[PDB]
């Protein structure tokens, strides 16, 4: 908590009184004359930082912020539904342990949960020699979530059975279901971040949130506030003529999709994450209806005449398809 990093690429300094070290960092970015005063053992530690923020999106500070042009590209085959590319990627040969973490996520997305549990299992044998542990801790999480996914199936394939798919069918053998409840019944997901070295803690302190629901908590609180002030600007008949009041809900949405599909986390198949996406995009369409049927009665807007509108791109069609039910779309079509 030395600098607010907002979702528009600006930086606002809060809770800091010492040397402002992000202000001096973006002075290094703009000028070249402040470079070449850098040590060669420190200058190679700059091209990695400059590529870190041009990949992630931290452009400048709050004061020297001009345009807010920010597109989006979720480069992940699981976001796009390339199924026949994934089959040819699992049939391909293993190369590293990073290419098997990206593999086991693809079998999970393909419903091959018997073989993806086994593939996460091999990564747990191998990743201690990786000296990083982030492939280890994220595989411990992802394997536990595949396990919890094969328990809600067997209490619904062996529970419901008839009305779901034909008769009482068994996608998992009786040997497998019996054995995985033996290898991981002493597991506690609440103590997975605590049972790791103090070098992995305080260097990956942002990953204790993936054990539970508190990686959605700061966005759920900001949905529930920005919902209430869009609904109350709509029950008032008020039309702001600048930036949209729910551009936070759009940018904070696509951070959560580019975090979880790129880093290959099986938390994309939750109910609580599916429910965050549809409440975020119901608000973006309920406001998009509100803004295209407006009336100024002043022969159009003089200064706001070049205002753009919300329109469905490709990424908005995919987020309604995966995350809405049909009754969620039925409401959105009658409202």
């Amino acid at each position: 908590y030395d600098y607010h990093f907002e979702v528009n690429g600006t930086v606002v300094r809060h809770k800091n009184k010492g040397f402002g070290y992000m202000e001096r960092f973006f002075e290094l970015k703009e000028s070249c004359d402040e470079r070449s005063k850098l040590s060669k053992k420190q200058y190679e530690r700059f091209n990695a930082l400059f590529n870190f923020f041009e990949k992630n999106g931290v452009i400048c500070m709050a004061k020297d912020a001009g345009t807010l042009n920010t597109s989006i590209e979720i480069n992940s085959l699981a976001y796009h539904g390339k199924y026949d590319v994934m089959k040819k990627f699992i049939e391909e040969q293993s190369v590293s342990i990073e290419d098997d973490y990206k593999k086991a996520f693809f079998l999970a997305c393909l419903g091959r949960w018997e073989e993806s549990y086994d593939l996460y299992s091999n990564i747990i044998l191998n990743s201690i020699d990786e000296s990083n542990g982030c492939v280890y801790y994220l595989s411990q999480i992802n394997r536990y979530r595949i396990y919890q996914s094969i328990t809600q199936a067997v209490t619904q394939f062996n529970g419901l059975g008839l009305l779901t798919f034909g008769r009482h069918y068994k996608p998992f053998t009786d040997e497998f279901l019996a054995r995985i409840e033996r290898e991981m019944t002493n597991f506690n997901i609440d103590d997975l971040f605590n049972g790791m070295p103090f070098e992995f803690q305080k260097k990956y302190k942002i990953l204790e949130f993936l054990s539970d629901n508190q990686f959605l908590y700061d966005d759920t609180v900001k949905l529930f506030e920005l919902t209430n002030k869009v609904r109350s600007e709509m029950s008032e008949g008020s039309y702001s003529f600048g930036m949209s009041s729910d551009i936070v809900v759009l940018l904070r949405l696509y951070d959560n999709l580019r975090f979880l599909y790129e880093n290959c986390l099986w938390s994309v198949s939750f109910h609580e994450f599916h429910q965050y996406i549809r409440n975020s995009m119901s608000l973006l369409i309920e406001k998009a209806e509100y803004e295209r049927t407006r009336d100024i009665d002043e022969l159009g807007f003089s200064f706001f005449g070049k205002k753009s509108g919300f329109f469905m791109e490709y990424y908005d069609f995919v987020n309604i398809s995966r995350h809405f039910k049909i009754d969620d779309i039925k409401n959105l079509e009658r409202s």
Partner: protein, 311 residues
Amino acid sequence: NVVECIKEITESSRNGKLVFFVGAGVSTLSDYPQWWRLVDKYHEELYGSPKKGNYSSDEYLRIPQIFYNVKGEMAFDGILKDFFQVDKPTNPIHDKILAMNPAHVITTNYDNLIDTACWKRGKYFSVISAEEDVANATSSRYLLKVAGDFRKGFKGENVVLKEDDYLNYDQNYPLISNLMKTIIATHTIVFIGYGLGDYNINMLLNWVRKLQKDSFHKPFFIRTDPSPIENETLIYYENKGLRIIDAASLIDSNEYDYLERYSAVMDLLIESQENKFITKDDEVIDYIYGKISPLFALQYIRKIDLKHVFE
């Protein structure tokens, strides 16, 4: 008795105060090559063939040291690299050991079998095998490999095997003895896979005589030998500070069937922890009481927290 030892191992496992002392007698339930098969190989490069004679101990101690002095240290290293690049599985004993939830695991073994079972669950253990790893450690759970390990080389210097290594153990490894002895006085120590005459057990029982009367807790010794213990040997070692649970005095098995005796005690510990022996209906009015008698100091308890009370 067996029954009070059942309790004190369980309620020390629930406090973060249970440490095993794992021997070579459970690395070979997972079938790792024993040391007597090495000394038969060292006997065949120096001499012709081992005319056994039941191995009087004066040959059983010196033969690694003799081939060390004569042939060169290069040959002592590759024979270890021959016999110990084997990649063996884990027995159910290792799974039952870690399901008993240890704070530490001390071990006299130079294999890597217990660390791989510790990597496969939700807990991290700082491996100390050498002398340098005491300061550059991580997270206060320690897999303490007191005999050395081949995690940084199959050379013979890393592991103590010879007789120049037993009497120079306090000189070469000062900090691995001090950290071994600190865990013993603090924690509750259970031995796994020793045979009551050992260089790792009798060098412990001589240090324990140097302590005061009640300045330590008595270690537990899970004994798995086919012939059962006699009472006088059970007198002599209980007087020296070992509470021996004998596995042959609870089940009966053949003189070649080890895993049944090793599991009849470890199932007796875990299924005491995972409560399966509760009858007479006045044993339920003190299992529930022991989880709720702390909570009388609170006026109201959330109903989502009472599931964490009852585990």
